[PDB]
Symmetry: D2
Amino acid sequence: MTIKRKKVSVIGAGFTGATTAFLLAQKELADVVLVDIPQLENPTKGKALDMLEASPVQGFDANIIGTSDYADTADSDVVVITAGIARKPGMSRDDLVATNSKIMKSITRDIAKHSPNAIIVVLTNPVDAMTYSVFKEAGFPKERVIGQSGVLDTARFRTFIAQELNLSVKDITGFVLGGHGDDMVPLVRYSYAGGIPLETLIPKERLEAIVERTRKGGGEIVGLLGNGSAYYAPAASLVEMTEAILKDQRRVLPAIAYLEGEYGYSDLYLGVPVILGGNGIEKIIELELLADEKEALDRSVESVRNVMKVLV
Amino acid sequence: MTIKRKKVSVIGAGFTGATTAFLLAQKELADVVLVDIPQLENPTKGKALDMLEASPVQGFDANIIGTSDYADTADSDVVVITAGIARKPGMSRDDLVATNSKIMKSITRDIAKHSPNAIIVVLTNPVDAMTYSVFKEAGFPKERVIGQSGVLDTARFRTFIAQELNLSVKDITGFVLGGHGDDMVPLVRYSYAGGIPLETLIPKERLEAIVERTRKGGGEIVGLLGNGSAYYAPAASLVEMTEAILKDQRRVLPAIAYLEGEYGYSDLYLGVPVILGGNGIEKIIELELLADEKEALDRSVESVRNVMKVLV
Amino acid sequence: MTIKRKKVSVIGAGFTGATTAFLLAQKELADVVLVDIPQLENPTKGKALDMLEASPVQGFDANIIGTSDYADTADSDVVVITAGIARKPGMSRDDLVATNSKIMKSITRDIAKHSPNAIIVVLTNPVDAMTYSVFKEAGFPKERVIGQSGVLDTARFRTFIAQELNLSVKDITGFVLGGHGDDMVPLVRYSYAGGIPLETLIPKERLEAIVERTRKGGGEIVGLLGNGSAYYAPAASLVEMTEAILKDQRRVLPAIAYLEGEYGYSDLYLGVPVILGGNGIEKIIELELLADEKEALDRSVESVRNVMKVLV
Amino acid sequence: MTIKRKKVSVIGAGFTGATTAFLLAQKELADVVLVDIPQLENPTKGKALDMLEASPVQGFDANIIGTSDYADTADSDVVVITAGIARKPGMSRDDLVATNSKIMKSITRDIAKHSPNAIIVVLTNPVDAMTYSVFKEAGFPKERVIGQSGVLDTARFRTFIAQELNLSVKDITGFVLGGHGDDMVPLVRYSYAGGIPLETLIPKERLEAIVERTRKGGGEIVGLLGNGSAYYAPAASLVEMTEAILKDQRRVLPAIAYLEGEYGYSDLYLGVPVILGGNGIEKIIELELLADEKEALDRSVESVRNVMKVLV
C-alpha cells in the first residue's frame, strides 16, 4: 500500500561500486545499499555516509547505507555486482575468471537468497564468463541475469569520434557486439554522427585507429593511472542499464545476454543488442550480419567458450 | 562574438578535485581543466579521460582535460583549489598551514598570472588561514578570493537532522558561522525543518549531540575510511558555490570571506553569511548575534589569527 | 513481477491540468492519463499527443494519453483533480462551491471505482470545501485525499521576496496556514532568506505589502491576463506534491488536510503543515501559534465551515 | 567583469512563445524577455509572472519579464521569433507568407537595432520563406539567422516509431531535409532504432504510413484541438536549438539555413543538416543523396522559391 522507493544493492565498494551508488542516489532512482565484506565494513560505511552527506547540497532524496550483512539487501529490485579483481593488460582471461568466479559463488547465493526476484547486472570481468557463472548459481531466469560490456565500449568510441569531429556526444552513436578487446565486433556501418554514417565523415585509417583505441580503452586508462582502473565511465554505464530497468524504458542497448539460439549460438553469454526494461532482457535483437562480422563473432564465441572451460 | 562555455580549472587531482571536476562537467556548467604537478601528468590525464568517456552515457557536453601546464588554465572564470595535504584528527592547524601554505605560493602565482580575472574558491585546509594566504599572493580584490567551509558543515548537519526526523533533506536548513570543529559557531535558532525551528522538534540533548557530530564530521569519515578522507560532500559543496558564481544566482550561503569591519572584525578571513554571485562575494550579511554567539565567534577569530601567525 | 512505471491520472484538460501532465511526464515521474469529458475527447487527445511528441526532443520516456474513459485511469497511484470552474475575483466561494461540487460528485465516484488505492490531490476551488466534498464521496482514508493551496501561496510569496531582495529563490522560504486570500494565515516569523528571518531584512510596511500581494496573487494573474487564469505556478505546485508522494520523500509542505483534533479543530479540511510521502499525509505538524495567529486561523475555520454549509 | 547570465528574448506571447520562455527558464539557460505588442502588454506580463512564480517550486533561478518595449531585448544572445499567424490545413503558403512577412518587417528591424550580435531562430511559418524575409531585413550574417523545421518533424517521426516498436524515444532517430508537409524529404535510410536501420524492423507500408503521418503532423494536432495548434513539441524544438547555441554544443540537427552553393542550390533557405553551436550555423553538412532524394529536394526548392516570389 505505501508507495515505496526502488531499492538497489551495489556489491563491492571499490571505486566503480561506490561511484555507481552515488550516481544512482544522485538521480533519485532508488535507495541504495553498498555492500562489501565484514572486514571492510567501516570503510563501506564511510563511503556511504560521505555520499549521503552530499545529498542536501544537490538536493537529492535517497537513503544510502553501507553494510556487510546481506540481510540489508533484501527485496532489491536490481543488484549490481562490481566485486572482484579488476582486469588489467597482461592478465589472461583464464586466470581472472578462476579468481573472480571463486569469489562470486557465495556472493551470488547470498544475493539470490535475499532478493529472489532481483535483476542482476554484472560488471565483474571477464564479464561474458562471469555473467554465466552468476547465472548458473542464482537460479534466476536468463532474462534477469545480465552483464555490462558494450555500453562502456560504445561510450569510449563515441567520445573518440566526438573529439575527432568536434561534435556533441549527444549525436554520435556506436555499435558493438561480442565483448571487450579482441572479442569486440564493432559495426562501424551502424555508427553515425546525427544519423550520418561515420564512414562518410572520417577516412578509413583514422576510423580504424579509433576502433583500435576503443578495443584498448580500459587498458589505456589503467596505463595513465599507474595504479587503479577506470570507474567513472564504467559506473555511468551500469547506471544507464539500471535506469532502463527501474524505469522500464525499453532502451535498445548492447548487453551481455544468454543465448539459446540467437545468432545461431547456444548456451553462452555474449554481447548482443537487446531491449532492456522492467523484465530485464525484453528481447535479443538479431541483426543481418555481413560475412566478415559473422566470422569475427564466431571467433568471439570460441574465445568466450574457452574461458568458460575454466569454471568449475 | 562566438558564445563560449564557461571555464573552470580545478587544482589538485586527488579525490575531492577529481570529483569536483566530474560534477561540474556532469551539470554542463563549464569546460573543465584538471591540474596537478608534472610528475602526475599521466594519472591526471587518465582521470580526466575516464570522466570524459562517461559523458556520452549521461549525455553531457563538456570538454575535460588533464594537465600540468598552467597555460591550459588561461582565462578561467572560476579556479577551485583542492591541492595540499588533507586535514586529519591529531594534525594541528599550525603544522598543516605551514605545509599547505608553502605548497600554495607558486600555485596562486600561476593561477593569477593566467586568469587575472578569475574568482578563486579555496578548499585547502586550514581554510580560514589558507584562503588568506591565497588572497595575499593573488593580487585580486577580496570579493574574488573565497573559501569553502560552512556549506559542507551545514550539509552534514542537515543530513543528521533529516535522518533524526525522517524528513526530506530538501526541507532541512542549518546555519553556521566561523569554521570547522571547535571554530564552528552554529546557530540552531536559525536551523529549521520546513521553516519550523528545530528546537521545537528535537530535545536539547539530541540536538547537542547532532551539533557535536557536525563539529567532528570530517574526522568521522576519516575514521571510518581508515585511509583517505571525505570527498563526495566536499566536492558537492565546491560545486554549489561554483554554480552560484557561474550562473550569478545570488545565493545566501556560508562562505569564508575577508572581513574589513563586518561583525566588528578586520583583516582576516572568517566563515560568515554571504550573497554569492557573478562578482564573487556580493555582500557579507551581518546578523544580530546573541551574547553567547558573539563570544563563540570571538574565540573563533582568535583561533584563526593564531594560525595566521604561522604564515611567512 | 515486471517493474512498472507509476501512473498518474490528471482530471481536467484545461491549462492547469495539461500543464501538470506535461511537467509530470517531463520529469519521468509516471505514465500520464489526461482525462476530460467525452465531448472534448479529441482536444484532450490532441494536447496529450503534442506533449508526447515533445518527448524525443527533451529525451523523456513517458506514455501520455488523452481520454474520456475512466477505465483508462485504472490503478492510478495518484489522481490529480483540476476539473471545474476557475476561481475569479468577485465570484463568491459559495457560488463556486455549488457549481464545482455538483460537477465533481460523478468524477470522484469514477476515480474511486477504478483506483481504490489512489491518493487524490485536489486543485479545484474553493479547495478547503472541495477537498472535503471529494473526501466524503471517495470512501478513502483521510490521509489519501488532500488538497493543494499553500504551496502556490508560498511560491508567490517567495517570488516577491526574492525580487525584493535580489536573491535566489532557492534560499527564500515562506510559511502559510489556512487557505487563500482572506483565509491565508501567514507566519512571516517563519519566513526566511537563507534562514535569516525576513523581518530583519525588510521593513514592516514592505513586508505587509508583499503579504497582501500574496493574498491577492491569483487575482493579480487573472487581472493581467484579461481572460483565463494562472496555470504554470499552480501546475508546478501540484507536481511538487505529486513527486513527494510518488517518491516517498516526506517533504514538509503546507497542504489542505482533514483535521480530527489537530490545532483544536475537527471535521474539516484546512491548510496546515504536513509531512507528505508515499502514504499521503504522513503527519500533521502542530505548531505553537501566537494569539494573533490563532485568532486568524479561527476566522479561517469559520469561513471554511460557512462554505461547507452549501454542500448537499 | 561580472559573470552574467545569457539573455534570450522570445517574440510572440502565444502558446508556443510562452511555452518556449518557460522551458528556457526552467532549464536555467538564460534570463528571458517575453515580448508582444503594446496592446497585449498586460497579458504578456501576466504570463511571465505566472512562469516566474513557478520558479521557487521547481527551484530554477531565472528572471522572466513581459514587455512591449524592444529596449528590454537589448543585447540578447538569442532571439526566438514565434510571432505571426499559425499555419493551418487549407491555408496556402502564399497567403500566409504575405500576412506574416508584413508583420515581421518592423519586428526584425527592432530586434536587430537592439541586439546587433544576436542569433535569431525563426519559428514563424512558412518558415523557409519567413527565415529569408528575416535574413534580408536584419543585416546579419547568414550563420546568425536560422529557422526551425526539421527538429519538430523528426520529433514527431521518432514518437510514431517509438510507439510502433514500443521502444525508448531516446534510441529512435529520424532524418529529414527540406521543410514540412509536401516539402519534407525524409531519409528513412538514415533513420534507426539503436542504430539499427528502421527498414529492417518495420514493413514498408507501415513505415510509409508513419512518414505520411509525419508530413501531416501539425495538421493532425490542429484537427484534434478544434481551435489552436501544437505548442509543446514546437517549443521543445526551439529550446533544443537555443540550448545548442547558448552552450556551444555543436549538435548535428536539421535546420532551415541559407544556401550559397550547398547541395547545388543558391540564394534560399532550405532544411538541411547543420552543426549548430555558439556561432549559429557552424557548417552545413552535404550528404550524398540518392537520385530519388535529390529529385524530391529539387521539388522542395522550387516550392520554396515560388513562395519567395510573394515577398515584397
